[PDB]
Amino acid sequence: MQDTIFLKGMRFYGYHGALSAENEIGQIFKVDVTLKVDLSEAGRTDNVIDTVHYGEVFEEVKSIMEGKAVNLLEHLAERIANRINSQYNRVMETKVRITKENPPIPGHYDGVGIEIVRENK
Template sequence: MADSVLIEGLVVETVVGVYDWEREVTQNLVVDLEMAWDNTVPGRSDDVADALDYAAVSARVESCLQTLRPKLLEHGAEVLARTLREEFGIKWLRLAIRKPGAVPAAQAVGVRIERGEKTETGVR
């Protein structure tokens, strides 16, 4: 089993960056998440209590990054991944954070990390 829950294109407005001017304004970050989750139980029960609450995960992503106000996207990704895994019991996740407009010639710059272990038979 390799089930997952996706949250894609979540926009979070926060302070981010290393330059002095960046510490005085908010900018948008775009977050994509893929989280290992056994979807067979909620798939059978049709009960939201059995599912990973993506609204709660999304709210936690927003509050984490807004409180953290990271200088580096790498730091934001590490803290966010650890927070989500601990608070929601997510065994594996793939996380991307992009910063649109950071480089004029690019649509966005960003980082992507994977944390935990995902196996063919599920997650450990």
């Protein structure tokens, strides 16, 4: 089953980071969420109730990304995957990618970050 629902390049200004100065200044966090969902029923019915609504997922991601500052991207993604998996039984698995395009790293690069994949129990 290779069907997926996705939200790409969601950007949020947050205050996460292990560094005091990061928590103070903040920075933009980029998030990609890919959900493993069987979309054949919805494909047949065209009824919004047979799939997972992207809008609701974005709201979840946003509440976590723009909420309380934490140290790690690993913890933020863990919270998001866990939030999506808990509320939607149709989601078989949640992939969360978080990128800091402008972390406190003296250099030239496109971004740094983490990606996790959590199956829905």
